Amino acid sequence: GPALHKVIMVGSGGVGKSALTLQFMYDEFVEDYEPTKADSYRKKVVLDGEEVQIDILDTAGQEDYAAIRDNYFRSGEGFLCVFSITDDESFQATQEFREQILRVKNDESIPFLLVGNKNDKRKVPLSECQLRAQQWAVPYVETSAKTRENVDKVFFDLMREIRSRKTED
């Protein structure tokens, strides 16, 4: 049947997680975004010649709520852990969100991507950040907020990750 990939995005409220979802789902017509519609976070996309739908669940604005994410993660098929390179607080919270989704899943090799967003005031280095992703046995991709670089990469690489998981039985 028709495949549907469900990806969850985590990070602290200020990493511009919203900017990543909008830039991916909407290209030249980002202005025509309606936040209330049922279609709002669903895109019919061609992944590797295969026709497939994607759903993106973003905790934008809802980061202070206590229990709600537990059900977002359970069950979401894909996971994108986003941090801002310029700050230390959001990169430190990566550890909190990492165990948080594992506290809901018993899967070490669950589809995952560690990503840095937003260089003039970059406090973090690409050496100390890579020393956390590959230690979690997970690929690392550097993204830019407004330039539209590695935007499609992170949503396509993760969709393949769950395509690989859906095959495994």
Binding site: G13, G16, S18, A19, T21, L22, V30, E31, Y33, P35, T36, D58, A60, G61, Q62, Y65, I68
Partner: peptide
Amino acid sequence: LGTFLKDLVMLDAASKDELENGYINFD
């Protein structure tokens, strides 16, 4: 309230406050 906060944060990122000329983007 969360659903409303999500919409407004999302909507904040969909548009710039100002146009290139410096006008307030009332849209």
